[PDB]
Write a structure and sequence with these properties.
- The protein is mostly loops and 12 residues long.
- The chain has no helix or strand.
- GO terms for molecular function: acetylcholine receptor inhibitor activity; ion channel regulator activity; toxin activity.
- Keywords: Acetylcholine receptor inhibiting toxin, Amidation, Cleavage on pair of basic residues, Disulfide bond, Ion channel impairing toxin, Neurotoxin, Postsynaptic neurotoxin, Secreted, Toxin.
Length: 12
């Protein structure tokens, strides 16, 4: 869901 950030893409 929080895939809208380079450090959150691998967190979505």
């Amino acid at each position: 869901g929080x895939x809208s950030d380079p450090r959150x893409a691998w967190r979505x």
